[PDB]
Design a protein around this ligand. Structure first.
Ligand code: FES
Ligand code: FES
Ligand code: FES
Ligand SMILES: [Fe+2]
Ligand SMILES: [Fe+2]
Ligand SMILES: [Fe+2]
Lengths: 180, 433, 433, 180, 180, 433
């Protein structure tokens, strides 16, 4: 995917604060299982994407990530996400009933303004800490590359696009029952 | 040490009973590597994972690392990913193209066929190079799928597969062009015995037709529907292989269930139109009505599993008695419309990836089973495998082989019985079909 | 292999010697699950945990997960938290209220008594449901506390405890209103053998009265008082159970020890006033001056430890020879003043939780012991258990039974001698009192 | 506990920075064992709370946390916290002598103005990394719900209330010899 | 090492954001294996230091970290750092070919101004997630004490001095093939 | 359980064959702790790690924790870091100065000799303190280095080392003023077997002269040139110890290889001027051209390894068949100039640290080898130790003992043969030199 393209003219302090506070609020919604609230942040043209990552020699490093027509961990539209919210808020959704306990620690927020005013490309790092049942702990880490629009909702922003670059090849977790 | 008498008592096919120690015992696992994985036909992937000369795929046979690599002559060799000098891994990436392989420890150089061609300082310190290449496995192809086996004495793939081949062909033999593997191979770790995973795709439709996948169904059906409005499939059949412990299960005349998992386009592609009619004409030599066979699951013993109707295929890699790795990829008809290939890709991710709306629930059950088996009393009493006992016969007008009802365990009983035979019989003279 | 002869030589109470291998050996551990945990009375909690019909608590018996649930007939049932079909956990939450129990795998349904009441597609696929419910355990209550045992040939709970009951009654039988459990159960993991934890509450005041808990006492004594004041208690006694390996120790006539741990308001409650006077009257049939008895510790073999004066209570779950899980909770007299219930609550959290000023140091000790026992030479010589050897007698005017000095290892030798018998002797015919 | 109720009007950049800095300063005191300096931040009326978490079915989700009259991992006043500082700084406090090596990574800071001026309700996420002796590593993750007051000390603030919501049911560590 | 001597007056909002963004950009270079771009950030007088930490009784806490003339995990100069860059970018550098997958989550950024204009002493905390090959996961936590300089370069600053205080005695990891 | 016959068939030094099960078998490891580590001389550090009375270092002998401690009479005593009471670690810090040692559990006090001097409440509850102190070990010093052995029957350090001593003297006996240790000791964890690491330093120069350290050499050469300016060393020798399985290897007349690793200032110190001329005078009685010997590697069997030319030294701590800990430190000549000491320090960090340009790649190979050995087939065929078979002899003008070419496995064959001997022969009556 190559190093994120931060502008030399950094985003204003007012703008830097808004995006961070948006991610802090977002993580709060997810960590407290307010899934309907979080889902309302996703735009109708949302593309939710987490590609596979592989072990390659440096000379073939451009094959590290899976592509548009390869399999992925997530490759979701607004419609497919809606079914997942229905499953995760369902009594018969065994993988999250009883639900897990997660923590999204968000940092390393870099903001880029796009050709379209009030639309921003955002880079952020994270650790997702998942704890399930008695003693299960899966620790995920990675970066998120978002496209965010200024929106007239409770958080002041909506998610237009999300790519999650996870720092794993083989997944050490048995499932991805959580949202990134 | 486990006597052949003690092995035979671990699985009772007549009574429909399973000793739960078969899922937890460390001594039984060491023997599984020797007696099961060390001489079984194990899936490594597809021919299209290695199209060109020098293309490779690093994978596993049991817990033995192996290299699948396409040759100059268009054949495929499979050798142990280990240098016979001091044991260093020869091929250190997952996939790609190679002109040669070289051991990073002392520079023992190998060609793409897996032969030791160069030893540094050989003339000064040495022994014949032709004799010291990594151990080679037998390679066999079945309609695009690539299997491998260490034992020179084991039966060939076609013999090993037997009357299960018809049910494989439902996925693999639909078009003259053949199948191609969608790029990318998902990998995730589940702390549970491999036998639970193998059996579930072998015999267990029961879990999907009851409680495990109620929420997965909820994810697929339109926003207007609630779960109580979704028809629960009941009609169907289960196959048990004549030999090998293979098994498949499918629904008959149940289009609604395929609609929920794979969507309107795939359901149209599979049952109606030119491509669906060509598949039935090609599989007429079996007599099966493939356009009516939906929601199919299958296992090729030991650790090869697929969902033929969904084109989802997966390999279980054993990691002790308490752990597996799941390596999953998907297939499509090579000449299928791009719109159909994309729909197959989408719903295979949506339902059957590690974050799939089905898969999540499967591993959730398996984690607790393996957890429960840590206890002494949890292994003191046999498990129930009595479902559909003495109910299957070989004279079914539609489906070939030993055929019973879809919610049965005749396939499972067949799997564990073959497992028992594999562990208790040293010689292929008794085991061969 | 472990012959009965080899097991007898691991514990020598006459000489006061213990083989360190008992805390580390993997095959010895597997026998403990069978010979010890498979037939002993194990604590699961308190009656008030399950006060109404359908109220359940997910807990463990050894490594076997169990459901403790209250019935319509006001009794408590304890069944194995495993479905006999394919192993799945029937009860998937820590605690709550149930009308029924349903398996998430294949939908096998149970009533709250643990009976299998419904199997999906039984008419079509099937065997009698009465024989395929989860394994039940014997359940017996002792004044609030709930115990379980698998072995139907093991002595009843009252017999099993024997002359240990009086010392339990110090905590349990203080009022006709009884004891109630405070909501919440702390759970944490220590990488150490269970016998270390059991022995320490059985016989070890020597650790609390020397070095382990200097900082725990420093945290308790008034801010104006530094450690060089605090008076180290010496007056005291120790009880060894006639049979069972149980034990208990306490300080006599030193309220200043109770003052540091539990504060002034609890010290008053335990020693002065109507409530303290009533308790001594009620325990009059034992003849013990309970108002003089402070800083008490106790273990009911194998893994039921508690601190009667502090109302702290704890169950040890074995997790291999090198690990345990500590499940802790606290009691209060049901009719005790709200201020007294609050003081027992605060001070148990402060001292004996995972982050408690006492418990921190207990865990620090046990972690390093288990680390050391990984060595060869660290398991090559016996450990000294010679303290108070031949110093006890069974004729004490105040305290009934085999009584010695507070700092002694007589109860320990009893705990290990009983352990040794449990492991060496197959039948209860020679094992029972 | 539900999603933290952040204000629609977000705290100004000056205040956001001041709170973030305070936590960074506090984490520097704890990770460098300045225990007497840390304790000086705590007000006489402090409540230092960390409840138990249990696995409950969605239908019984309101019973996930232990209450005010239940057991907890921590439920501390000024007096009892003082006793803990006296232990942790002691030469015979074995659990932290030799001392552990900790790291408090603080992020996700959400500031809420209260009805009292110069008093703020602050939500924050953390990973606490703890390393003991030879090879012991315990990784904690959770969130903190604080009530902070402006104070006349070297850090700028005082701690009036602290609730730690730890993402664990069964604790995977042998003890909690660290402060949160 | 004792608590970081933070200034009484906190750094301005512009400066706090400049230093933070520098580290977010720096972590982007490392996580995407831009070793050439990252090396250009180091001044020629760079001292890249990472001392050993030992378990000591409270009475001997002044002997925790190793010194100037003791062994270290890293004790590097510009010349030696370049050799390390030359090894990691090498196709025949086995320990990082195939490469690892690193994540530097950076927070706790405290900025101190020195007696030299445009030169700053900065404290920060981190969690370095490292995932290698199939199943290898190594989690590092620690503290960075840098001397940074205003630079006419891409990231806005250059590195004059770096001390990394790692929260470990025995490394649970088989190597330190990554940069901090 | 292993019969002597089955052990002997794991190492064939005649054919040059190794059974790969020696690196992976759990049962063999448990025997190694008893039969190899429980009676071999193991390096604990240097005399200058504990220079003052009461100075200590906490280290390991196998998986047994021990305490190096300098006494009043200037001798070093080594004892088990375990209290005989209940197993608690006596010494709880890595290093420092002690006036005594106290157990944190029950307060058993010990002086700096490991003698039990105080037991709390002894008069009141107790047994002879002189018999209950921790287990002592035989301590012996070779020119700065501190070794320990449990076995009273085992040969003395000198006889144990034998003809390997001249090769140790290359690093140690260069000054009358002796060596000192640079402060600090690096501890990291590699998931491989100890025999891989110990063999490499014993017999494997082959890896440094081929592929392993291509990037390490690249790090050591000027910026303007690459590996095409780096010449491969092909001149040198290897030594196999008469008894003990010790071994060394080195380059002769290859100053370029020292320069790339240790820089110009060390190269000149090692090869030219007064200190190098003094070393040549002192070491002349061995006949060796010490000034021309570079890149030396050495293993004192079992787990003491060093690189004499670089002054790097390490102990491998076994942690199961599939894990070790590496404890590394570095030496200098006590009287060597400050700039020379600094260069030895700097370059040891750059090269042989956990993150060293050389070390990284060494450990990388071992990790992948151990992973492979989880497989059945990966252990089914023997490994090749056939390098330099029958080419060594005891007739060499320059170098003493059984000497062959630098790229050879003669020392490796000697190491494993001795390992096999120690594992299969129970009595020192047959094992002694
Ligand atoms: S391991 Fe020695 S060259 Fe492959
Ligand atoms: S496990 Fe099959 S229904 Fe319970
Ligand atoms: S363990 Fe050393 S005093 Fe009891
Ligand atoms: Fe399923
Ligand atoms: Fe204690
Ligand atoms: Fe090397």
């Amino acid at each position: 995917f190559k190093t994120f393209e931060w502008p030399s003219k950094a985003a204003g302090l007012e703008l830097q604060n808004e995006i961070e506070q948006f991610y802090y609020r977002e993580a709060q919604l997810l960590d407290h299982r307010a899934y309907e609230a979080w889902f309302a942040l996703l735009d109708k043209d949302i593309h939710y994407f987490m590609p596979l990552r592989t072990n390659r020699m440096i000379r073939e490093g451009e094959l590290e990530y899976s592509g548009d027509q390869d399999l992925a961990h997530f490759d979701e539209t607004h419609e497919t996400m809606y079914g997942r919210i229905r499953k995760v808020t369902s009594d018969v959704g065994w993988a999250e009933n009883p639900p897990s306990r997660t923590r999204h620690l968000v940092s390393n927020v870099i903001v880029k303004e796009t050709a379209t005013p009030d639309t921003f490309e955002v880079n952020s790092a994270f650790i997702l800490y998942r704890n399930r049942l008695e003693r299960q702990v899966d620790i995920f880490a990675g970066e998120r590359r978002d496209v965010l629009r200024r929106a007239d909702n409770n958080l002041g922003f909506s998610i237009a696009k999300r790519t999650i670059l996870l720092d794993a090849s083989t997944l050490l977790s048995n499932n991805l029952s959580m949202f990134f | 040490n486990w006597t052949p008498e003690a092995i035979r008592g671990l699985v009772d096919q007549e009574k429909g009973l399973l000793d739960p120690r078969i899922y937890a015992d460390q001594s039984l696992y060491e023997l599984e590597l020797e007696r099961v994985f060390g001489r079984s036909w194990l899936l490594l992937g597809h021919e299209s994972h290695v199209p060109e000369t020098g293309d490779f795929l690093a994978t596993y046979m049991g817990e033995d690392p192996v290299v699948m690599v396409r040759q100059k002559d268009k054949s495929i060799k499979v050798f142990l990913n280990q240098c016979r000098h001091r044991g260093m891994r020869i091929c250190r990436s997952d996939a790609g193209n190679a002109k040669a392989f070289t051991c990073s420890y002392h520079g023992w150089a190998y060609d793409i066929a897996g032969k030791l061609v160069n030893v540094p300082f050989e003339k000064e310190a040495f022994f014949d190079k032709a004799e010291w290449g990594p151990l080679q496995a037998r390679v066999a192809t079945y309609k695009g799928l690539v299997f491998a086996n260490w034992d020179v004495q084991a039966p060939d793939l076609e013999t090993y597969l037997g009357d299960a081949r018809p049910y494989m062909d439902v996925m693999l033999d639909r078009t003259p062009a053949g199948t191609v593997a969608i790029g990318g191979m998902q990998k995730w770790v589940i702390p549970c015995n491999w036998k639970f995973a193998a059996e579930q795709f072998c015999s267990d439709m029961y879990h999907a037709g009851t409680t495990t996948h109620l929420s997965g169904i909820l994810a697929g059906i339109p926003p207007e529907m609630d779960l109580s409005q979704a028809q629960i499939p009941t009609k169907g059949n289960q196959f048990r292989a004549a030999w090998g412990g293979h098994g498949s299960g499918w629904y008959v005349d149940e289009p609604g269930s395929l609609l929920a998992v794979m969507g309107p386009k795939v359901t149209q592609y599979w049952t109606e139109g030119p491509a669906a009619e060509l598949a039935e004409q090609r599989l007429g030599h079996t007599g099966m009505p493939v356009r009516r066979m939906v929601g199919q699951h299958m296992t090729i013993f030991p650790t090869c599993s697929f969902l033929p109707t969904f084109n989802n295929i997966r390999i279980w890699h054993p990691r002790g008695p308490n752990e597996i790795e799941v390596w999953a990829f998907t297939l499509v008809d090579a000449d299928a419309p791009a719109e159909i290939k994309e729909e197959y890709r989408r719903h295979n991710i949506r339902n059957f990836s590690a974050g799939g709306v089905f898969e999540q629930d499967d591993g959730e059950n398996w984690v607790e089973i393996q957890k429960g088996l840590r206890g002494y009393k949890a292994k003191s009493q046999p498990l129930n495998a009595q479902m559909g006992l003495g109910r299957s016969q070989t004279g079914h007008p539609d489906f070939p082989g030993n055929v019973g009802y879809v919610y049965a365990e005749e396939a499972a009983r067949g799997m564990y019985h073959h497992w028992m035979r594999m562990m208790s019989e040293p010689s292929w003279a008794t085991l061969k079909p």
